[model samples]
Target: KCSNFFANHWKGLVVFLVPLLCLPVMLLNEGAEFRCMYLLLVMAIFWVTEALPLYVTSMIPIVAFPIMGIMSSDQTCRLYFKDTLVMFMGGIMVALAVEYCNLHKRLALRVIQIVGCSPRRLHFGLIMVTMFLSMWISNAACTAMMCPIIQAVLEELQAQGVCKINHEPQYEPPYPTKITLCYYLGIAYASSLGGCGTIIGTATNLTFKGIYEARFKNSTEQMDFPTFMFYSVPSMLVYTLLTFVFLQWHFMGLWRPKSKEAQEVQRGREGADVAKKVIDQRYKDLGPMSIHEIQVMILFIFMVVMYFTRKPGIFLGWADLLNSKDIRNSMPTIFVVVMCFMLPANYAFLRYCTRRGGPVPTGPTPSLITWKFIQTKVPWGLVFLLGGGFALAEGSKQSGMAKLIGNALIGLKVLPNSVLLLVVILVAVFLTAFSSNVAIANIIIPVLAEMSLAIEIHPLYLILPAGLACSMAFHLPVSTPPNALVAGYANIRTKDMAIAGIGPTIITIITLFVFCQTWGLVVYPNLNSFPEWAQIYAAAA
Candidate 1:
């Protein structure tokens, strides 16, 4: 009872005292250092508590930073948009195109049809489809799209007498059955894990990119798409396999398909047949593919291939060939997105002209995409959130607050590099469970970068793991949107998600730390000595 009371009232208490706490900083401050700290503390409090919408909280920095004399309003505004932001925007545009054309649904149904419909196979199929989609789109969007389909599948199971629903006094089921639980948890967890596969996968990934580049602007170290893939893909693969096995054991009963309980609960062969028909019917309902979907698919494929091969390192990368990094990467994405806006959805004018039939070529060909749809449907709030994070990072760096924070942590230098990496990863994972991962990256990555310099070790050793760990928060409904979305539909109690998520959280931490120590060494060697690229920042300092 006391714990609940604390949970409910802590934000209000913090709100009351935070200003009081900041008074001392203001009293002793000059030249924006303490003021920046004050702004960050206020934003952090509101972001974690969600006292306002996150984007609204994000807007505080733009107004408060200038008002506090930390940065000019113009400078703060510039931080809200950059090449990295444009790249993220373009990627989201492509994802929107996919969703607009119903391509995502087609892809999901197609994969389900191929994967068979045994409870285990169906579960695996859902995970694979959701994960694959999330690698290119937002995790929350993927979860939102998948949930309704899963609900439809569940209803079909009930209708076919494959599974029995125990509706409770409340409208929701008494508790989700084991099969139902598996589907819910699988989609939520897999969406997060899939995001670890690509830089465009999550906002945090882009946040890391923006922070790293801004902090190490003079460094030779460039964490482009391929370099990130080299380190992250292997870790993502291992994490995915472990997550699959653990979920199977904990929720799906890996070896108990033949049990009486499994048979009666529609997890056996009979259930599989019924589920297969449902999936087949869903796929059939999509009908023949549309021209718009094919165009979007081709464009998506082209973008992925271009992203991968842009830095393949044979006789200077494709990006290098362009002589401008932004042109090579961000521009291509925007260009493709522009094509979506310009391309005709159909060639009906040509068909009519060739047949000499009813109508002449019309006023204008209908576009595959529209600005209105983009404005309303696209997550512009996330763009604001990213900008806010960038502003905070820029303000901290400019005001010397980041270095001051690092100086305070200089005592951590006494610890070994391996131990320091472990601590960074552990802290990132823990904080992310209760807050936005993007906000955590914004607050933590820059500090870790500065701390690396303070400790005389490579920054990537600290920053890369910290960035990846931000995406590993799976322990609570509030930790991530995908988790929250699934929990809402699955009738999962907070306690249930906590119990199931704890094991995977621990496993991911250890596995990430191990990857950093071993495989990470191959991509970035000599953790004990600082690299020349990192030397420039410390030398300038």
Candidate 2:
């Protein structure tokens, strides 16, 4: 019966069963909070191990918390829905609007067209376009937009019988299977790398920003959009370029021009047509640009500029319109508000504006913003997963399980900060390999933060690396959104990605260590301010 049930309803069934499976174990332990922790540990492991869909895994906290009495159903529900629900919903709505308008495609194509479509050039163009948009749009949204294009490319390859790597007929690509696998991996990995280029590139970046600003009183040298880009873009560009070059060399044996079929796809669908249509239709009835789009663009730019400078002079007299503190608080909120207005509205201003030669205009009609797009696109399950994960972490804190775990680890005697940083990055990459990056980051950050305080090290060093590492879950289906986003296109096995990801992962760790060491030993403020024991205790505490 269990076997049959597993086979029939694996995803939903596992989501229901996984946490319940923990109840007997949790009750045996008789520590509600620790039990929550245990349950989370299991869920987290399952995610990293690719044992389940990440969204389903995210629901573990919601199910376990209320069931085990860690949180009331109301609180659990609120945890799932509050704060992020609207922002996520609104942001998704805007993504849909962009998609509907075809503006995203248009933007992507303009870059591709100007750059040319040689294999290496196309790869760079795609990566750049993806990274640039991801800087402003959410990573998931950006990935969603690009995934189809990537898949289309793969499908075109398949149709032409030019297998990407091993010429697997499973997905019908004529290229070698390994090359195909690498291409998919490139998309997945590059999308993630692009996101790391900016704070707004990923939601976790915002969480880090929020936490850092709150703790440091807005005085720390924060990673804003452009600065973040400056620091990370080099890494992104180099690695992204490397991904394209390495895969081409390793799998295809050379960086060659496109085949006939590849050329046809490139010249046609992958070019400007989709983008042109999307952008043109968006403003068709209203004129060249909608009032909402223009306003939204302006608002978004202003917020980004203010966030970076934090100085009144950057925006001239406009900065005086509000206090600096109020301005800081207002930017994110205003971005959210502007996004709502940018949702496609049914009414047009032209309806009421009388034209001398035009037909009598009808009064404006109310266009309802559709929630279907949100329902369809937003990963609702992940919200519960994140909430539940947080609840579990909270339970661990309440029950002293986290400290117990930390203490045991701390007993290992003051690992070097450099070593600890590497360990944190590795563990983060490992766990995120199967779980939602956001969920993992949320769970890990608080513990690392508390530990940093306990040991007297800068929380930013540990927590920031952890956050970035979460974004680097490049190996499996359940890890980062980018991996999942790209998985649909490539017919590669999980094992294939894991194998390929090993190279990137090692490189990432080495690169991160170099950066953190340089930053910690030299660049980070008050380097070595805390002794070894202090840093550990702060980390564990």
Candidate 3:
């Protein structure tokens, strides 16, 4: 009977059997706290089985929480929308504008023109462009765009015999047969790497904001756009540089093949010139910038300025000048969203009416992005998924599930703090072996945050690493979208991903740990001690 639905077998099991497991939990005398845990339990199983789309699974709480008596039906929905969600929506709106106008494509081709020529140089250039775009664009979009560029470039070089190389099985894995695999892997890994740089880069970072802010209501904007960037950006740069080093060493024979004389000759200066020509032609095709592209460019520039200079504390930010610390950290992104919503693609309408009112040629009077144009582009499911995660978090707190979990960790006081944090990172990284980082961040980070308060240590010290450790899924495709995008689009096998993934994963763990002690300390002053806000909860009880 199960064999008939084998394709969706896991869905059947999760949808049916898992709630039966919950039936026993809710039968107990505990006040809706375990019911909240029951909510976490059902959501976890559905999400883990990959049986339900996370967004739809995330939607479970909308009905589940209200009915469970864990939280008010009205109070429960408030968690679905928050300032952090606004910031992400606003941020991606700009990407939609950039993408629709192909503004970044112009910028992307322009960068390659400068990086220029050599096989290794172009490989480095391609990876750099992919990461840079991912810092702002979604990783899936960033990698999806670059893969075509990669496919075209590699094929162009191979067409002229420049990418041709011979391999002996002794110096294997990335043998000449799959020599360019390094570029694809570089892009897939680097897309997630760049995402950690900004809060807008990934869903998990925004999840950090919702739970952290909701938990510590006394401090509204503890980690704003600039502050979060300050912590994550330094780590992103270190990882990106170290990543190139690994890719170069691993793919050395293909990069600098000395075994065959003709191979070297073909992959030489003439080869480099041909590579340069392809980018040059592509860049030339972009022609002159349009008013639409220029307007979009201004939005990106305005956003960067507002994000970095906003609260440096070194000097006055736009918010400081306005005495607007109370303003949501999403202010910069929202300002740009409004711009994209209102700005015109062309000035022809204005030009025609400048002297006086008159009817002009009627074709299209478009905004930088229209609702219809972008209706299909936005990850509509993600908005609900994000809201769903927040609902569960709020429900957990309301039901006392957070307190029970936090109290459970108090037993670790005798354990060394270093080992405690090290354990947190290990568990987060390994657990990412299965689920989406958002689901991982949604459930686990909050648990760790509560633990910090229970242990009387700074919440950020424990929370930041676990939240970020789930940043990129190095070992497998399922963990991150970019890996899957690259694997499916190109000729990559799962084993190929595992072989490439292990080194990046090890390096990521070591680098994150070192960064937590070094720059992590620099960005947040009170990272070592428990905060007054955490103490507020202590007083409340």
TM-score list, all predictions: 0.88, 0.74, 0.85
Q: Which prediction has the highest TM-score against the true structure?
A: 1
lDDT of 2 by residue, 99-129 (tens): 6544554455556557754555656677666
Model 1 TM-score on a 0 to 1 scale: 0.88
Residue 479 lDDT, candidate 3, scale 0-100: 74
Candidate 1: tens digits of C-alpha lDDT, residues 1-541: 9899888787677778777876787678665687777777777777666666657777777668767777788878887877777877787677777778777667767877888866667677877777777887678777776787788766777787665443342443586666677677878889888888888778898778867776677765667677777888887878887888888878655667666455554535666666777778778888998887888889888987777776675436676667653464676798898788878887777767467667665578879888888888666767787787778777777888888888898888677767777777778877787777787788888878878787788887778778888987777666777786787756876777778887778779878877778886687667657777677768877
**Models sorted by TM-score, best on top:** 1, 3, 2
Residue-level lDDT tens digits of model 3 in 91-136: 6667777778766567667777788777667768877777778886
Global lDDT of each candidate: 0.76, 0.59, 0.73
Model 2 lDDT, full chain set = 0.59
Best candidate (score: lDDT): 1
Per candidate, the number of residue pairs that clash is 0, 33, 0
